[PDB]
Each structure stands twice: as C-alpha cells, then as structure tokens.
Amino acid sequence: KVFGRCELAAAMKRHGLDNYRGYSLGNWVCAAKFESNFNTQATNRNTDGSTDYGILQINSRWWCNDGRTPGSRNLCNIPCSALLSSDITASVNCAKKIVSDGNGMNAWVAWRNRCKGTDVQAWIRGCRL
Ligand SMILES: [Br-]
Numbered sequence: 562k563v564f565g566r567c568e569l570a571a572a573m574k575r576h577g578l579d580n581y582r583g584y585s586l587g588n589w590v591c592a593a594k595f596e597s598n599f600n601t602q603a604t605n606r607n608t609d610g611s612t613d614y615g616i617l618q619i620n621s622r623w624w625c626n627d628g629r630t631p632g633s634r635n636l637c638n639i640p641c642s643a644l645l646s647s648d649i650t651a652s653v654n655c656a657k658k659i660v661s662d663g664n665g666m667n668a669w670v671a672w673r674n675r676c677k678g679t680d681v682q683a684w685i686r687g688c689r690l
Pocket residue numbers: none
C-alpha cells in the first residue's frame with residue numbers, strides 16, 4: 562500500500578508514534594517518506610546481504626527474520642514479510658524498539674540526513690488528526 566501523507570500521519574498517531582521517545586509525529590512521517598516513499602512493500606537489498614523492509618526500511622541483520630541473512634538476529638521477533646503489510650502494526654512495534662535502543666531516530670540514516678533539524682511539522686500540516 563502506498564499511503565498518502567496525511568493518511569499515514571493519522572495511522573501513525575493511532576499507533577502511538579506521536580511523541581514516542583520524544584519524536585513528534587512529523588519526524589516519523591518524514592522518515593517514512595524518505596525511507597520508502599510511503600510504500601509499505603518497499604524492499605532494498607544491502608551489499609552485506611541483509612535486506613530492508615517496509616515503510617521504515619527495517620533491516621534483517623538485527624530486527625526481523627528473512628531466512629537469508631546469516632548470523633543475523635530477529636530482535637523484533639517477526640518475519641520480515643510482516644513489515645510489508647498494508648497494516649502498519651508490525652512496522653510500528655518494531656520501530657518503537659529500534660528508536661529506544663540508544664541512538665534514537667539516528668538509527669534511520671535517511672532521518673538523520675533528510676529530516677533531523679528540519680521543519681518536520683510541515684509533514685503533518687493541514688492533516689485532520
Ligand atoms: Br480504525
């Protein structure tokens with residue numbers, strides 16, 4: 562599913578991401594924009610053989626199991642395929658674990674490089690929330 566901006570903001574808010582670990586909703590929408598272009602089915606294979614999955618491009622080296630990333634962990638205790646669903650529950654629950662692990666949203670390189678320090682409120686501007 563390719564979400565619209567405001568639609569994703571509302572869903573992320575229903576799923577408890579607004580101000581989660583202190584990160585306002587716009588940070589999460591911005592991250593999703595630049596990680597996946599709001600496409601829940603986005604995948605990206607990395608040169609190390611791990612793969613990134615879903616709206617927030619969560620990586621199989623640490624967070625989910627895809628059966629083809631040797632020596633990896635599955636710290637979110639999910640199949641990576643769950644991160645591709647039109648329902649964002651699995652991606653949100655895993656993202657909550659990732660953002661709590663020490664480095665905040667810097668865990669998403671695209672967030673650090675394209676959202677951090679910017680007017681992220683613009684991503685939710687005008688949306689019915
Ligand atoms: Br609902």
